[PDB]
């Protein structure tokens, strides 16, 4: 799993 | 910007 | 920035 | 786990 | 202006 | 992730 | 100005 | 991370 929120 | 990855 | 990894 | 919040 | 990569 | 705001 | 890196 | 505010 790998997540990013900008 | 939003991403996700699994 | 939020960052997620497992 | 590894998380990073700014 | 405004730029956005990823 | 890279982004520029002018 | 605005610059951000991840 | 590498953020710059002017």
Do not use: A, G, I, V
Request: aromatic share 16%.
């Amino acid at each position: 799993l790998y997540q990013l929120e900008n």
